Amino acid sequence: KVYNSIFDQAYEIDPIPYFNFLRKHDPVHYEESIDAYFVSKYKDVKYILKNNDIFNTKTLAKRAEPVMKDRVLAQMSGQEHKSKKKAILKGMTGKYLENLMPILEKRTNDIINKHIEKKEIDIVNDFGKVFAVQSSMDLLGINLENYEKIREWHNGIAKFITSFNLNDEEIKYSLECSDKLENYLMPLIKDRKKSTKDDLISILLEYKNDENSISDTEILALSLNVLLAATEPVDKTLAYLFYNLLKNPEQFESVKNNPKLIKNAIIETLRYNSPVQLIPRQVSKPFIFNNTELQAGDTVICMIGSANRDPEAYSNPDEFNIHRSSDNTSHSQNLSFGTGVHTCVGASFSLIQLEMVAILLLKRLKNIKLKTMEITEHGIYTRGPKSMVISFD
Ligand code: HEM
Ligand SMILES: CC(C)C[C@@H]1NC(=O)[C@H](CC(C)C)NC1=O
Numbered sequence: 141k142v143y144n145s146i147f148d149q150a151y152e153i154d155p156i157p158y159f160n161f162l163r164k165h166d167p168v169h170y171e172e173s174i175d176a177y178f179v180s181k182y183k184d185v186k187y188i189l190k191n192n193d194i195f196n197t198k199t200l201a202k203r204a205e206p207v208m209k210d211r212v213l214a215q216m217s218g219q220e221h222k223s224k225k226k227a228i229l230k231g232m233t234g235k236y237l238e239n240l241m242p243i244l245e246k247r248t249n250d251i252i253n254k255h256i257e258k259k260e261i262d263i264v265n266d267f268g269k270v271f272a273v274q275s276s277m278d279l280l281g282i283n284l285e286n287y288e289k290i291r292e293w294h295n296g297i298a299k300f301i302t303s304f305n306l307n308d309e310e311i312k313y314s315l316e317c318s319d320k321l322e323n324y325l326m327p328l329i330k331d332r333k334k335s336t337k338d339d340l341i342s343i344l345l346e347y348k349n350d351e352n353s354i355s356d357t358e359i360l361a362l363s364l365n366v367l368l369a370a371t372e373p374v375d376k377t378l379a380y381l382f383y384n385l386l387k388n389p390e391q392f393e394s395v396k397n398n399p400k401l402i403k404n405a406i407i408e409t410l411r412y413n414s415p416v417q418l419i420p421r422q423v424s425k426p427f428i429f430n431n432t433e434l435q436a437g438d439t440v441i442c443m444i445g446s447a448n449r450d451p452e453a454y455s456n457p458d459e460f461n462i463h464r465s466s467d468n469t470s471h472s473q474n475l476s477f478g479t480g481v482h483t484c485v486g487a488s489f490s491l492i493q494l495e496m497v498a499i500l501l502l503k504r505l506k507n508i509k510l511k512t513m514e515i516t517e518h519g520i521y522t523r524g525p526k527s528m529v530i531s532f533d
């Protein structure tokens with residue numbers, strides 16, 4: 141019999157003691173309520189994600205396609221996945237990136253300008269959630285006139301993708317959000333293909349595979365994939381970043397005096413408070429980790445936050461330290477963007493965007509002081525603070 145469950149109320153309040161227990165005592169941990177095994181150690185998570193043929197992404201057909209309306213990038217393999225991944229990357233690199241970043245600076249400063257006279261701002265609810273959705277629409281090429289509705293519908297499909305055992309009414313609402321996004325974006329996709337622009341939607345329409353153009357619902361699904369993937373982690377990471385810096389004033393000062401450290405601080409925040417906590421895969425054939433036997437068709441769920449705090453991978457893993465280095469002590473590449481075939485295509489863009497935002501907040505909000513002295517965190521699949529208020533001059 142087992143008594144420590146991922147679904148204990150205590151886990152969502154504070155999962156760190158669970159991480160420590162599971163890595164030591166139950167590294168491949170079965171949860172009967174969802175018929176899945178949770179994998180907590182860095183070595184095992186990395187092995188699973190590096191081995192796309194043994195641990196495939198068929199789980200996503202279930203957790204995602206109902207709201208994405210067609211296949212997502214992570215469900216693809218082979219030359220199709222490689223090529224469409226490259227097509228998505230094009231939209232956040234090269235000239236597309238050079239054009240997008242001044243726009244994201246504008247989004248950042250407009251939000252700051254709304255709150256600068258108030259002398260406080262909620263990094264979660266005033267800045268992060270607004271900026272995150274606007275940035276994703278700017279990347280895709282969706283004009284912001286309806287961004288508030290977009291955010292509402294996004295939250296509904298994200299809830300579907302990040303939840304376990306939702307009830308029938310919650311499912312209904314998430315599917316209605318999906319339908320509304322489809323009803324809004326399909327007319328825009330049609331207009332885009334008869335008048336191409338310089339945005340990701342246009343790239344996807346211009347995509348050609350053996351002289352074949354993919355269906356408009358396939359475009360919609362990759363567009364929803366980008367909207368969800370780019371929006372959800374951003375408010376969480378921005379909030380955790382300023383919280384951890386304000387909780388470690390010495391490191392916050394080092395960052396002020398040396399802005400080159402902001403990139404390392406973002407990476408450490410992603411390791412320490414991983415905003416995407418879980419990555420599921422399906423087992424393709426009998427397999428064993430430690431002495432836990434897995435069968436073809438079983439589901440394994442990689443615990444990214446647990447892996448990123450594995451003492452086998454990091455010295456003093458449960459301390460926030462922006463000065464960690466492989467040149468120093470033990471240090472590894474964190475798994476916050478995944479690894480292997482499906483490594484986040486937006487990882488580099490994310491680091492550039494978050495550094496821009498953090499620079500502008502530090503430049504314009506003078507003498508930042510923490511007001512939310514103790515965060516409350518929510519979510520076990522994606523995870524972040526409910527609120528993270530700072531004050532400034
Ligand atoms: C801090 C920000 C972000 C984090 C922490 C994050 C996290 C992740 C993780 C953990 C995965 C792996 C999922 C898996 O293996 O099943 C992933 C994949 C992906 N992410 Fe991100 N993500 C971020 C931002 C973005 C952005 C800005 C985009 C913009 C398009 C994006 C698009 C994608 C896509 C398309 C995939 C699927 C990649 C593939 O299948 O090859 N993500 N992300
Ligand atoms: C969105 C998923 C259907 C596929 C894949 N999964 C991920 O974990 C990331 C982040 C989201 C969980 C926000 N994005 C991805 O594309």
